[PDB]
Design a protein around this motif. Structure first.
Motif, PDB file in Angstrom:
ATOM      1  N   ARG A  35      83.091  73.778 -43.165  1.00 40.83           N
ATOM      2  CA  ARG A  35      82.212  74.198 -44.254  1.00 40.83           C
ATOM      3  C   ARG A  35      83.004  74.482 -45.525  1.00 40.83           C
ATOM      4  O   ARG A  35      82.588  74.105 -46.627  1.00 40.83           O
TER       5      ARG A  35
ATOM      6  N   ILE B  76      76.790  71.919 -42.211  1.00 41.58           N
ATOM      7  CA  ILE B  76      76.441  72.619 -43.442  1.00 41.58           C
ATOM      8  C   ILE B  76      74.930  72.723 -43.632  1.00 41.58           C
ATOM      9  O   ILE B  76      74.461  73.592 -44.375  1.00 41.58           O
TER      10      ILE B  76
ATOM     11  N   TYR C 208      83.739  76.835 -39.611  1.00 41.70           N
ATOM     12  CA  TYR C 208      83.913  77.484 -40.905  1.00 41.70           C
ATOM     13  C   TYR C 208      84.901  76.724 -41.777  1.00 41.70           C
ATOM     14  O   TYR C 208      84.703  76.610 -42.990  1.00 41.70           O
TER      15      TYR C 208
ATOM     16  N   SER D 114      79.348  82.146 -42.986  1.00 43.84           N
ATOM     17  CA  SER D 114      78.832  81.221 -43.983  1.00 43.84           C
ATOM     18  C   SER D 114      79.817  81.133 -45.139  1.00 43.84           C
ATOM     19  O   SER D 114      80.366  82.150 -45.576  1.00 43.84           O
ATOM     20  N   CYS D 115      80.043  79.914 -45.622  1.00 48.02           N
ATOM     21  CA  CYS D 115      81.049  79.687 -46.649  1.00 48.02           C
ATOM     22  C   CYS D 115      80.674  80.397 -47.943  1.00 48.02           C
ATOM     23  O   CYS D 115      79.501  80.463 -48.320  1.00 48.02           O
TER      24      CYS D 115
END
Lengths: 145, 411, 72
Positions: B279, C16, B276, C40-41
């Motif tokens: 990301r 990603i 994370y 999730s970003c």
């Protein structure tokens, strides 16, 4: 009267208190906010009526380069009506004003009269020898003036 | 009762729902039995050639033909905007005044609002005290959840648990709690960041120090809140270390905060937090920066994952200079690989094979040619290694190619 | 981007573009918390992002006071 707010103190906490997360079955989130409610909150907390008019903020210091008669004369003429000098009066003065010192004294009185007549204003029909005698209390005039 | 009594002047008989549409009406016809029926929804049931009105059970004669009514339509639509706007705007603005301060009003008020949240197949209306019509498939509205979350999380934990329990007892909806758990986590994240990260700089750094000390002394909504708080902590650490050179000082608290974050990352034994973080960094300033800064062997590798580093070092041939010019189409990719192969193997026929199969106008074709020339030659020459640069023999090959092809007509 | 071969030749790119659950077995599983969508970003909603929202919605005359607020 200033619209006072901070970017992090009232802006983000308000804007993130209305960020709407809605999930439909089979579909991802929808993010549309209540923009009308955001405007209502802003206009209630900050944008209530408080106006302003620019009239001052000027460095009206003590002196700032005084001593011109043109603006003094403009104030005289715009504060009251000014006539001309009658020919009989000019003849009488030129007859009875035989010295430079007498003219200097009369003009010295007239200059103070001009200053007061500008800063205050008065009746254009009042006699000068009265205005200088019991209105300005210049109780030290000679007999020739 | 205001709304129940308002329907007197706007409708002679009073506006009531129908049975064909089970709600309001469009192109509404008033039958002789005084029932407002939607002609558009009338057709769907009357295409079966059995004219039966199931509401009043009236076998209407076939001579009568329901049709379009103008005055009736406008009378219906006036109220159909009336009551929606009135109830919605009242309920939101009373939620503004019912829940202003930090103190929750009562247990009963919120429980009654949550039972009102279903219509009394449970959630069909737009969160009103009335019997409003059936909307789309039940949507889990969080319009009131956020204003039910601005309070302290611990005091409202019972409220959140009750809310989730009544949501799970809603209907036959699938029990895939992922799509609603993520929403709940994001909403509580918004609440905590908007109510606990906006005091001031000094208060914020004191709060961060206290959080770090507490982390030293370290399905359920508690697990969701823990996940969200560690996510916020790692995101803060990311964008707090994701700064360019120029800040060697101030590391009195920087070295402490980064070290403690990495200590938590080591202790958790979970790679989800670090993936994370990767990301988030890629969203912050690009995947290229995280593919170049976290190169195999860089001393800066404690923040980024380790097994990924090993399996990328095994794949060190490809650094990650990915061709972002795919927006045109796969045709560009085809001629690009053809050009690369032709230049590498020292022949012009590879480029010509893609040259022949190009139906597009030659202007953007020459654009593709120049841009592929860039993508190969300039990117291979960008590396400092002269060996990795295109060979001078390849330069002469492409030179006699450009002297061969006449597509590049402009000087 | 996800379909191109070079994006499928680097684990960081697959981070990603792709899910570690089908790539790295070392990642924990069996929990609904650990999944692609939940972790999730996201994008922070900053004031300029509300300006972007106003522009793309073109609720320009819809909220004139808000217009003038995020103007300057």
């Amino acid at each position: 009267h200033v619209i006072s707010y901070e970017v992090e103190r009232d802006l983000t906490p308000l804007i993130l208190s209305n960020c709407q997360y809605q999930v439909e079955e089979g579909r991802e989130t929808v993010q549309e906010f209540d923009l009308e409610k955001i405007q209502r909150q802003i206009v209630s907390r900050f944008l209530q009526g408080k106006p302003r008019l620019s009239l001052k903020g000027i460095p009206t210091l003590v002196y700032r380069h005084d001593w011109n008669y043109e603006h003094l004369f403009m104030d005289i003429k715009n504060k009251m009506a000014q006539d001309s000098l009658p020919s009989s009066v000019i003849s009488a003065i030129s007859g009875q004003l035989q010295s430079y010192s007498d003219a200097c004294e009369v003009l010295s009185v007239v200059e103070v009269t001009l200053g007061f007549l500008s800063t205050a204003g008065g009746d254009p029909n009042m006699q000068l020898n009265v205005y200088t005698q019991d209105i300005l209390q210049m109780g030290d005039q000679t007999i020739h003036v | 009762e205001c709304k129940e009594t308002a329907s007197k002047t706007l409708s002679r008989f009073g506006i009531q729902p129908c049975s064909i549409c089970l709600g309001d009406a469009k192109d509404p016809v008033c039958l002789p039995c005084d029932h407002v029926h939607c002609l558009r929804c009338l057709r769907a049931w009357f295409a079966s050639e059995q004219m039966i009105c199931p509401y009043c059970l009236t076998a209407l004669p076939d001579e009568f033909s329901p049709a379009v009514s103008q005055a009736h339509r406008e009378a219906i639509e006036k109220h159909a905007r009336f009551r929606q706007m009135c109830n919605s705007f009242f309920v939101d603005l009373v939620s503004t005044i019912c829940f202003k301060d930090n103190a929750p009003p009562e247990k009963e008020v919120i429980e009654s609002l949550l039972s009102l949240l279903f219509v009394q197949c449970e959630h069909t209306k737009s969160l009103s005290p009335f019997n409003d019509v059936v909307d789309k498939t039940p949507v889990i509205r969080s319009v009131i959840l956020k204003l039910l979350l601005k309070y302290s999380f611990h005091d409202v934990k019972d409220y959140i648990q009750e809310y989730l329990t009544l949501l799970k007892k809603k209907a036959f909806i699938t029990e895939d709690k992922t799509e609603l758990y993520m929403l709940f986590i994001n909403c509580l994240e918004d609440s905590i960041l908007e109510k606990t990260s906006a005091y001031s700089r000094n208060d914020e750094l004191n709060h961060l120090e206290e959080e770090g000390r507490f982390l030293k002394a370290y399905a359920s909504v508690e697990y969701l809140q823990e996940v969200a708080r560690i996510r916020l902590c790692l995101d803060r650490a990311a964008d707090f270390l994701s700064e360019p050179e120029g800040g060697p000082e101030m590391a009195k608290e920087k070295q402490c905060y980064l070290q403690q974050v990495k200590q938590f990352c080591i202790r958790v034994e979970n790679d989800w937090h670090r993936v994370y973080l990767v990301r988030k960094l890629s969203s912050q300033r690009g995947m290229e920066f995280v593919q170049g800064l976290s190169k195999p062997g860089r001393p800066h590798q404690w923040v980024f994952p380790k097994d990924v580093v090993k399996q990328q070092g095994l794949r060190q041939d490809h650094p990650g200079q990915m061709d972002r010019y795919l927006v045109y189409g796969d045709e560009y990719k085809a001629l690009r690989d053809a050009v690369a192969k032709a230049v590498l193997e020292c022949k012009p026929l590879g480029i010509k094979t893609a040259l022949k199969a190009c139906k597009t106008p030659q202007s953007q074709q020459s654009a593709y040619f120049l841009l592929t020339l860039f993508r190969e030659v300039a990117i291979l020459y960008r590396s400092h290694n002269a060996s990795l640069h295109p060979t001078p023999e390849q330069c002469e090959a492409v030179s006699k190619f450009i002297g061969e092809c006449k597509i590049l007509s402009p000087p | 981007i996800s379909q191109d071969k070079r994006i499928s030749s680097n684990p960081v790119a697959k981070i990603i573009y792709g899910d570690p659950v089908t790539f790295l077995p070392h990642l924990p599983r069996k929990s609904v918390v650990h999944c692609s969508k939940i972790w999730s970003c996201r994008k922070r909603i900053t004031v300029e992002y509300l300006q972007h929202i106003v522009e793309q919605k073109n609720g320009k005359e819809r909220v004139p006071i808000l217009w003038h607020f995020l103007q300057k």
